[PDB]
C-alpha cells in the first residue's frame, strides 16, 4: 500500500503541475513590456549607526519609522533612534548567538533568538526604567532563524527543526505548530492583515500557512538551494524569495506559481535578505558580494546598487512609510539609505 | 541646536557608548574555542577537567576561556557555522577506539571514516581558513587494549606497519593531518589525552598561546 500512496502522490503532483501550467496564459514579462522603467535609483548613505562590535545578523524597523532594533554576535541588542543616531537602549543578551530580532508593532516589546533555541521577549516600557526579560519561549529543538510579532501577546517563530510555531506570550506556551517543511526553516514574513504568513526553508520550498487553523495552504517551488529570505508584497497577494543560487523569485498566492525571476549572469552569490518598497515597485536584495541590488520588481532589471558595506549584507529593512532603507552587515555597521 | 531633552538624550547615548566600549574591551581578551567532534567520541569527557549550544567558561593561568559545544544541534551545519568565524581555535575530539565500529544510522560505515569526513569538512571550510585546529585523540587505553585483539588494517586497507600502539597511533595521527589543504595558513596541534589532571588544559593553553603569538605576528606585519 506504500507504493500506491507514492503513486497517488505522484499523480497529485502531476495534477498540480498541469493545473499550474493550465492557468499560465502569460508571463509577467509580457504584460510589463510597455510600462516605463524606474530609471537609475541612486540612494546615498544618510546615517551610519556605529556601536556594534561584532557581525550584525538581523535588524527590524519600528512601526513609527524611526526606532529600529538590531542584533549582533557580541551579545548586545541595541535600539537606535535613526533620526539622530542616538542609542535609546542597549540590551545585554544572555546568549550572544542570536540570528534574529523583532520589534513589536505597539513598541513595548522586542524579541531575539538564535542558537540557544529560546525566543526571549524583553519589556521596554518598564516602571523601573530598565529593559528586563518578560518571557522566554522554550519549545523548539532547532535554532531560531526568524520571528515576527502578531501583537503584544502572539509571536510566530521559524526554527531550525523544520517547524514554525505560534506562541502565546502570557502563558508561555505554543498554541499552533506548523509542520510540513523538510529542510530547515530560515525566514518567515507575515501578511499585512496578519492572517497568513509565508515561510522559506532549506528544502527550496516556500509554504503559505494559515495562522488560525494552522494548516499549510499552498507550497511554492522553483528554487534550487537554501531559501534564506522571504517577504510579502505590500498588498499581501504576492511574495518574493531569496536563496543561495543567486536569484530572487516572485510568486503569486492566487495563480500559485512563478511570476518573475530576478537574476543576472555576473551574480554568483546567494541572497541573505530581501525587502520591498512601499509601493512594491522596487525589490531590494542583500547579497553576499558585499552589495545590495535594487530590482525593478515588474521588469526584472537591476535599478541600483547600494554598495557601501565592507562585508556581507546580512539584513535589510524598509520603513513602513517607505522613507528609508536600513542595511545591516557583518562589518558591524548599520547604514540608512535614502 | 539641540533641546535640553535632546542634550540629555545625547548624554545617555554617550554613556551607552562607553558601556558598550568597556564590554567590548572585556570581550576582546577572551579565548573563544569551538568544540567539535562526533557522537560518543569523547566530546563530553574533556569538559569535566576543562538543549542548544552549551558554553563552558573557565580560567587557567589568568586567562579566561569560552568553550562552545554545538553537538546538540541536529540541524544543517552550514547555515550556522559562519557564526563561529572569529574563534581562536577549534577543539576536535576523535575517539582512538572508533576504528572498528559501525554507525547505528547507516550500516557498513566506520565512525573513523565519518570523523575523517567531518574533519575534512571542518578543516577545509571557507570560514575556517586561518583558524588553527587543536586535535584531541582520546581513549588511548581502550585503543591499546583493542589494537592487540583487532588489527588496524580493517579500518585502513593501505596500512602496512605493525600492530603496536605507537606505530598505529602515529599512522592514524598522520592520517588526520594529511587532510589539511592549507598547511601554511593553519596549524594542527595534536594531543593524546590522559587520565592525569591538568595536561589537556595545559596543552590547550600552550596551543592558544602559540595562536595568539602568530596573530600578533600577523597584526604587526612580520608575517
Amino acid at each position, epitope marked *: 500500500e506504500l507504493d500506491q500512496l507514492r503513486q497517488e502522490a505522484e499523480q497529485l503532483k502531476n495534477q498540480i503541475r498541469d493545473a499550474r501550467k493550465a492557468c499560465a496564459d502569460a508571463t509577467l514579462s509580457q504584460i510589463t513590456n510597455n510600462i516605463d522603467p524606474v530609471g537609475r535609483i541612486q540612494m546615498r548613505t544618510r546615517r551610519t549607526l556605529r556601536g556594534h562590535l561584532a557581525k550584525i545578523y538581523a535588524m527590524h524597523w519600528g512601526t513609527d519609522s524611526r*526606532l529600529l532594533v538590531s542584533a549582533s554576535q557580541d551579545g548586545k541588542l541595541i535600539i537606535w533612534d535613526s533620526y539622530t543616531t*542616538n542609542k535609546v537602549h542597549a540590551i545585554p543578551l544572555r546568549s550572544s548567538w542570536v540570528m534574529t530580532c523583532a520589534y513589536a508593532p505597539s513598541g513595548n516589546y522586542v524579541a531575539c533568538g538564535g542558537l540557544d533555541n529560546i525566543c526571549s521577549i524583553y519589556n521596554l516600557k518598564t516602571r*523601573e*526604567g*530598565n529593559v528586563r526579560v518578560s518571557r522566554e519561549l522554550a519549545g523548539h529543538t532547532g535554532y531560531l532563524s526568524c520571528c515576527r510579532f502578531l501583537d503584544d501577546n502572539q509571536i510566530v517563530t521559524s526554527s531550525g527543526d523544520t517547524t514554525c510555531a505560534l506562541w502565546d506570550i502570557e502563558t508561555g506556551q505554543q498554541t499552533t505548530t506548523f509542520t510540513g517543511h523538510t529542510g530547515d526553516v530560515m525566514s518567515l514574513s507575515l501578511a499585512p492583515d496578519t492572517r497568513l504568513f509565508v515561510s522559506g526553508a532549506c528544502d527550496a520550498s516556500a509554504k503559505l500557512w494559515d495562522v488560525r487553523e494552522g494548516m499549510c495552504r499552498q507550497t511554492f517551488t522553483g528554487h534550487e538551494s537554501d531559501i534564506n529570505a522571504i517577504c510579502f508584497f505590500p498588498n499581501g497577494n504576492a511574495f518574493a524569495t531569496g536563496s543561495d543560487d543567486a536569484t530572487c523569485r516572485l510568486f503569486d498566492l492566487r495563480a500559485d506559481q512563478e511570476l518573475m525571476t530576478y537574476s543576472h549572469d555576473n551574480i554568483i552569490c546567494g541572497i541573505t535578505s530581501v525587502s520591498f518598497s512601499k509601493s512594491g515597485r522596487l525589490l531590494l536584495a542583500g547579497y553576499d558580494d558585499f552589495n545590495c541590488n535594487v530590482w525593478d520588481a515588474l521588469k526584472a532589471d537591476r535599478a541600483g546598487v547600494l554598495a557601501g558595506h565592507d562585508n556581507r549584507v546580512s539584513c535589510l529593512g524598509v520603513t513602513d512609510d517607505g522613507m528609508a532603507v536600513a542595511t545591516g552587515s557583518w562589518d558591524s555597521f548599520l547604514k540608512i539609505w535614502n | 541646536t539641540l533641546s535640553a*531633552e535632546d542634550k*540629555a538624550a545625547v548624554e*545617555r547615548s554617550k554613556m551607552i557608548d562607553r558601556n558598550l566600549r568597556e564590554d567590548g574591551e572585556k570581550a576582546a581578551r577572551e579565548v573563544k574555542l569551538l568544540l567539535l567532534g562526533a557522537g560518543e567520541s569523547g566530546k563530553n569527557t574533556i569538559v569535566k577537567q576543562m538543549t542548544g549550544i552549551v558554553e563552558t567558561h573557565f580560567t587557567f593561568k589568568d586567562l579566561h576561556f569560552k568553550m562552545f559545544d554545538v553537538g546538540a544541534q541536529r540541524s544543517e551545519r552550514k547555515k550556522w557555522i559562519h557564526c563561529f568565524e572569529g574563534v581562536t581555535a577549534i577543539i576536535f575530539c576523535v575517539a582512538l577506539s572508533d576504528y572498528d565500529l559501525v554507525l547505528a544510522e547507516d550500516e557498513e560505515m566506520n565512525r573513523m571514516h565519518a570523523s575523517m569526513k567531518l574533519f575534512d569538512s571542518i578543516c577545509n571550510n571557507k570560514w575556517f581558513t586561518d583558524t588553527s585546529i587543536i586535535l584531541f585523540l582520546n581513549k588511548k587505553d581502550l585503543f591499546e587494549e583493542k589494537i592487540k585483539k583487532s588489527p588496524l588494517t580493517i579500518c585502513y586497507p593501505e596500512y602496512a606497519g605493525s600492530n603496536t600502539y605507537e606505530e598505529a597511533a602515529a599512522y592514524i595521527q598522520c592520517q588526520f593531518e594529511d587532510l589539511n589543504k592549507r598547511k601554511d595558513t593553519k596549524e594542527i596541534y595534536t594531543h593524546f589525552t590522559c587520565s592525569t589532571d591538568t595536561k589537556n588544559v595545559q596543552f590547550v593553553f600552550d596551543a592558544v598561546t602559540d595562536v595568539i603569538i602568530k596573530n600578533n605576528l600577523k597584526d604587526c606585519g612580520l608575517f
Partner: single-chain antibody
Amino acid sequence: DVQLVESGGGLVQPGGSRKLSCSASGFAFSSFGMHWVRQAPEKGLEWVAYISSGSGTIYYADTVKGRFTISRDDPKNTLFLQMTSLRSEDTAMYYCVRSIYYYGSSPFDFWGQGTTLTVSGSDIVMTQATSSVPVTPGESVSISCRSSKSLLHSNGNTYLYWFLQRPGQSPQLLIYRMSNLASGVPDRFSGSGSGTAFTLTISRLEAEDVGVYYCMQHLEYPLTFGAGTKLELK
C-alpha cells in the same frame, strides 16, 4: 514599587547649613537624572537643582547658585543636597524628582514624598491666568497656561508639562510634552497647545481630581513652573 524617601530637614538658624538626603528604592537609580523642586508654604513649585545620570551635567537655579550643591551616590542610591548660608527665603518644602531622557521618555514621572525646611531675567515665564476655579463634578473644566516664547522646537516637540498636586501629598505628572498622556493617569485628561497658548481639557471631572494644577516648560533651563490653578468643589 518606586519610592523616594527624603530626610534631613527641620529647624535651622539663618546662615547655617543643613544636608538633604533623598533615599531611592524600587528603580534603577543610576540611569535616572534627579531634580530638586522646592515649594513654599504659600507659593507654588520652584526648581532648584538638577544632576544628570552619571553626574555629567549639573544645573542650578539663579536664586540658589553657589550656595547649594547637589551630589548623588549611585552605589547606595542616595541623592544629596548640601545647603550653605541658609536664609529666610529657603523656608519651604523640598522634593526629589525622578527623571529620564531618551526618545519618547516621560521625565518628571515620579515625585518624592517630601521633607520640609524651617529657617528662623531672560527666563521663560509660565503664567496661569486663573488661580482658582469653583467647579462641580461631572463637568468639563479647561485649565490654561501661557508662555513667554514659543515652546515649539524645530524637532516638533512642544516641551510643556502638566502637574496635579492633590492636597496632602506630592505633585504627580499628568501630561508630558504638551499632548502625551502619562502612565497610570486616566484618559479623561487631555492636553493641547499651539506653541504659545496652551490648555488642559479635563472631561467628566471626578472628585479625587481636585487640587492645584501647574504647568512647566522643559525647552530651556532653568525650569520654571506656573503660578498654580486650583480646582475646588461647588
